[PDB]
Amino acid sequence: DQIKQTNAGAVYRLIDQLGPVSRIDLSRLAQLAPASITKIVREMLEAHLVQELEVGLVVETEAWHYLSLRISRGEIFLALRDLSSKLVVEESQELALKDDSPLLDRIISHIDQFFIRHQKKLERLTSIAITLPGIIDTENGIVHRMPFYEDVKEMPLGEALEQHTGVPVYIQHDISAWTMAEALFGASRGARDVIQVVIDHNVGAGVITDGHLLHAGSSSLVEIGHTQVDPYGKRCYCGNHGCLETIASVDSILELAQLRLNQSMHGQPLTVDSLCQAALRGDLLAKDIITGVGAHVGRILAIMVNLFNPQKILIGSPLSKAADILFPVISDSIRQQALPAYSQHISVESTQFSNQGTMAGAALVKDAMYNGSLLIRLLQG
Amino acid sequence: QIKQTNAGAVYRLIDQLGPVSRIDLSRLAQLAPASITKIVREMLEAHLVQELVGLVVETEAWHYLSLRISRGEIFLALRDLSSKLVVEESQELALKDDSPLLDRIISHIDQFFIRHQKKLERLTSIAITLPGIIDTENGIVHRMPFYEDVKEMPLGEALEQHTGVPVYIQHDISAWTMAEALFGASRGARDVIQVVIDHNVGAGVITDGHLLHAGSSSLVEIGHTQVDPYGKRCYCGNHGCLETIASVDSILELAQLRLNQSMSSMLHGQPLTVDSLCQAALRGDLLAKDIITGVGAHVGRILAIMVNLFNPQKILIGSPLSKAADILFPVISDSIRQQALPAYSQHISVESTQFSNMAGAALVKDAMYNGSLLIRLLQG
Amino acid sequence: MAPALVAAFGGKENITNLDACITRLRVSVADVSKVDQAGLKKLGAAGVVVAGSGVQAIFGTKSDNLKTEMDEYIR
Amino acid sequence: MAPALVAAFGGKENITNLDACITRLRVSVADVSKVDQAGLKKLGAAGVVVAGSGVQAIFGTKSDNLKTEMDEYIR
Ligand SMILES: [Zn+2]
Ligand SMILES: [Zn+2]
């Protein structure tokens, strides 16, 4: 197959989103040949991917599972999900960062560990999607460089893992994957244009225009993480000094809360969760740190609005807890700095999935079923 | 529908590489022998493409009206779908008149058409490029910089009704951005950033070969990003905008106000003109220099964030201020490289646009590509 | 089909020049005010272009033929 | 047919669990290295998926039947 592949993944896309549709409806919507529709449909009907609501066709997802796992700083989160992406079981493990055994192989172990203990819940393995920070060659599944795990350098954690299981491996950058994952499931659903800022151990944001994720130079992902908001600040691992991600990064915000707690005001150790809660209650010291971030992000997200004009702005961060204090700041900024005709109908809202939800690969597998490069393999069983 | 997006995508192909056979169209465009062969069959029967194995495009009998509204002049011209020029006008526009503006613009177009009523071979659409806040969806120019009279102008709806072809609203800036990429200086590039610095400030961006649009095709109003929280009112209703600080007028107004005070400048004698300021900024004048530097520094900071978003190949400047390039450019680059992801800024170069004074072209080709204009052109 | 098509442009007294390409019916009138937009479109036209002093009726392949039918409605 | 399946998966002293989907033949095993995947394919498996310690052999409709075969062959 070659066009039978996209031709197929189109009928599925129509039945996954518009179901229950009729054979006729499908030949009219996909604009493909009538007899060509009955063929594809019948194959899915036989391979148990779609079923007849007895005229009336609607995807079958329960019996098929995929492994969605995201690796973000010394933690690996593994979950089994439906082809609709409904989860079955989720679990968070560890990774230490430094170890006598490479990361490449430690990751494979967890996957084996996960499967063993959940071999009775697992059904038809279709694929595994992995999402992680770092420079990722997505079409080959090779992690080139990666934050947190110093010793990486060209890791074929996609090919070796594909052989060790025999199902496809889809690997995408953490933010990009998440952004579209939100766009199909949650928060920014029904928007062609979307800005999603992510603020955690590393700051960066993703954007969607017309209906496509924005890329640069080569793949050169959007790097608003390195936009000098402070002409001095600290030194950044990039080159400049005072990069957004030196003030807005959760780790900094916590180094700031600390090195500003040593000089009077808490009670329990200092964590992002305890910070937000303090600012939530009414503390002026934590509230000032949160507002401060929103001052900066806001400035940048201001010009990012005159460029894209999204229907939704989303903030992905453990700080979405302090929604009441941070967002208003970003909103003012965008309302005070971007064009009035744009900032009118647009509110800074929260991300629907945590920085830890396995739901980030939810799109990789959907893109696989739609583009056909999977519905064709599964067609065999 | 799917018919429009599938039809305009086969056309979008046949013109980017001529010739291409019914096989490359089925293959390269992802389409079966039924929905790739028959889609050309109706395009051949409508003469949007040409015969001779190979398929090229037919763009000579098709024309479109393009016009630009400057701070005070209405430029007109008819063009092929290949963007070739058929005829161009030079009619003055002025500010105040008996009739409003919308009606004045119509008469202008109507005039242009009666004279050159023999050049036209077939009208498909009209594409306008003017300054100000625009609705585009309905083509309702809200307010403008030099016609305080204009309040909610249904230019799009009106010009269509008076002819029978679609109207395209865009800024002089966006259009010029695609022009530079088609024969200007960014011809051959896939990622460009073009800043304009005249009576209006703005920037067109090209992402992976495509001209960046906005949400709901609302245009990029990068010129209205606040740079000075205390600056003067802006026609957009906000204040301190980029168009308010870097606008060539404001530069001179700022120089002029500062000259009117206790200050020295090799500009005291010679009256203030856009040329005289640069000419004097180059000779070292602390005033003219620092005004441009600052100007450069104000556009650079913004342009630095856009580098981080699009990591462009080339960055183009289009302004009379490029006469004092050795003061501007080096500053914008210095602002680019000191506040942007190094790897992105350590292989970027500011260069001036190699053109001056546009014309739709981008909105008319894309009108064909989306299949919107194509479907309406398939019956004609 | 063409006697009512000449009236849709105003009439022999308003049509200064009758012409037609492959798919359009580029007719030049003396007064666009008199051009019946409805009747043209309710007779087959998919669109009517009024650029200046010349109308362009979009009928299709019938155009090259219609320009001939209308010229006979004089003699 | 049944005894070949047991052999390919490593014989009774390796099969720790044996189940079947509507299109696959899921069977847990004590040691994946002792499983002859090449054979599973030669016998009629469209594909062989290894998820942890449970080998998924894709046979199709003929899968819930072979689970019953292999089941009596282990006696
Ligand atoms: Zn940095
Ligand atoms: Zn403004």
DSSP for B159-211 reads HHHTTSS-EEEE-HHHHHHHHHHHTSSSTT-S-EEEEEESSSEEEEEEETTEE
- Name chain C contacts of B123, Cβ cutoff 8 Å: 49, 51, 56
Residue A233: both structure tokens together: 């600040």
Residue pair B48/B107 in contact (Cβ under 8 Å)? The answer is no
Q: How was this structure determined?
A: X-ray
Q: Residue count of chain A, please give it.
A: 381
How far is B223 from A50, CA to CA, in rounded Å?
Answer: 51
How far is B220 from B215, CA to CA, in rounded Å?
Answer: 9
- Name chain C contacts of B108, Cβ cutoff 8 Å: none
How far is A374 from A379, CA to CA, in rounded Å?
Answer: 8
Q: Which residues have CB less than 5 Å away from ligand 1 (the ion)?
A: A 226, 236, 238, 243
Residue A241, burial from CB neighbour count under 10 angstroms (0-12, 13-18, 19+): middle
Which residue type does A1 have? D
How far is A349 from A327, CA to CA, in rounded Å?
Answer: 7
CB contact B230 to A (< 8 Å)? no
Residue pair D43/D57 in contact (Cβ under 8 Å)? The answer is no
How far is B337 from B342, CA to CA, in rounded Å?
Answer: 6
Residue of B nearest to C56 (CA): B122
Q: Which residues contact B315 (CB under 8 A, 6 or more apart)?
A: B192, B193, B194, B195, B303, B307, B332, B336, B348, B349, B350, B351
The DSSP H or E segment spanning D7 is helix D2-8
Residue B10 Ramachandran class (φ > 0 left, ψ -120 to 50 alpha, else beta): alpha
Four-residue CA torsion sign, D70, D72, D73, D75: positive
CB contact C39 to B (< 8 Å)? no
Burial letters for D33-68: b for 16+ Cβ neighbours within 10 Å, e otherwise? eebbbeebeeeebbbbbbbbbbbbbbbbeebeebbe
Q: B224 CA distance to ligand 2 centroid (A)?
A: 4
The phi, psi pair for B314, rounded to 5°, reads -130, 150
How far is A256 from A236, CA to CA, in rounded Å?
Answer: 16
Within chain A, residue ranges assigned H as helices are 4-17, 23-29, 34-46, 103-117, 160-163, 174-184, 250-258, 272-281, 284-308, 323-337, 340-343, 362-370, 375-378
Residue A82 Ramachandran class (φ > 0 left, ψ -120 to 50 alpha, else beta): beta
Neighbours of A100 (CB within 10 A): 6
Q: Which residues contact C53 (CB under 8 A, 6 or more apart)?
A: B113, B114, B117, C28, C29, C30, C32
How far is B59 from B57, CA to CA, in rounded Å?
Answer: 6
How far is B102 from B93, CA to CA, in rounded Å?
Answer: 12
How many structural domains are present in chain C? Answer: 1
Q: Which residues of B touch C (CB under 8 A)?
A: 46-47, 61, 65, 110, 112-114, 117, 120-123, 162-165, 376, 379-380
Residue A77 pairs in a beta bridge with: A70, A92
Torsion of the alpha carbons at A365, A366, A368 and A372, rounded to the nearest 10: 150
Neighbours of B99 (CB within 10 A): 10
The range of the structural domain enclosing residue C37 comes to: 1-75
Q: B238 CA distance to ligand 2 centroid (A)?
A: 5
CB contact C56 to B (< 8 Å)? yes
3-state SS assignment for residue B326: coil
N- to C-terminal Cα distance for chain A? 17
Residue B277 Ramachandran class (φ > 0 left, ψ -120 to 50 alpha, else beta): alpha
Residue A212: both structure tokens together: 């496509």
Within chain B, residue ranges assigned H as helices are 2-13, 22-28, 38-44, 102-115, 155-161, 172-182, 242-245, 248-259, 274-281, 286-310, 329-338, 342-345, 362-369, 372-378
Neighbours of A234 (CB within 10 A): 12
Burial letters for B48-81: b for 16+ Cβ neighbours within 10 Å, e otherwise? bbbeeeebebbbeebbbbbbbbbeeebbbbbbbb
How far is A159 from A169, CA to CA, in rounded Å?
Answer: 8
Q: Is the preceding peptide bond at A310 cis, omega within 30 degrees of 0?
A: no
Torsion of the alpha carbons at A244, A310, A342 and B95, rounded to the nearest 10: 110
How far is B329 from B349, CA to CA, in rounded Å?
Answer: 9
Q: CA B29 → CA A6, A332, B26, B32, distances in Å?
A: 11, 45, 6, 9
Residue pair B255/B272 in contact (Cβ under 8 Å)? The answer is yes
Neighbours of C49 (CB within 10 A): 22
Q: CA C19 → CA B1, B63, C70, distances in Å?
A: 34, 18, 10
Size of interface A-D (CB pairs under 8 A): 56
3-state SS assignment for residue A272: helix
Q: Tell me A21's DSSP state.
A: B
Listed residue (A187, A197, A222) closest to A294, CA to CA: A197
Q: B240 CA distance to ligand 2 centroid (A)?
A: 7
Four-residue CA torsion sign, A288, A290, A292, A298: negative
Number of alpha carbons in the 13 Å side-chain half-sphere of residue A380: 17
DSSP string, A303-334: HHHHHH--SEEEEESGGGGGHHHHHHHHHHHH
Residue pair D55/D49 in contact (Cβ under 8 Å)? The answer is yes
Residue B304 Ramachandran class (φ > 0 left, ψ -120 to 50 alpha, else beta): alpha
Residue A60 Ramachandran class (φ > 0 left, ψ -120 to 50 alpha, else beta): beta
Residue entry with tokens 């496509």: A212
Residue pair B181/B206 in contact (Cβ under 8 Å)? The answer is yes
Q: How far is A280 from chain B, CA to nearest CA, in Å?
A: 29
Q: B242 CA distance to ligand 2 centroid (A)?
A: 7
Q: Which residues have CB less than 5 Å away from ligand 2 (the ion)?
A: B 224, 234, 236, 238, 241
Residue A332: both structure tokens together: 């003012």
CA A96, distance to chain mean position in Å, is: 23
How far is A38 from A356, CA to CA, in rounded Å?
Answer: 42
How far is B214 from B220, CA to CA, in rounded Å?
Answer: 6
| Domains, chain A, with CATH or none | 1-61 (1.10.10.10), 62-188+354-381 (3.30.420.40), 189-353 (3.30.420.40)
How far is B86 from B116, CA to CA, in rounded Å?
Answer: 10
How far is A189 from A193, CA to CA, in rounded Å?
Answer: 10
> For residue C73, what is the domain's CATH number?
3.30.1360.60
Within B211-318, residue ranges assigned H as helices are 242-245, 248-259, 274-281, 286-310
How far is A239 from A345, CA to CA, in rounded Å?
Answer: 37
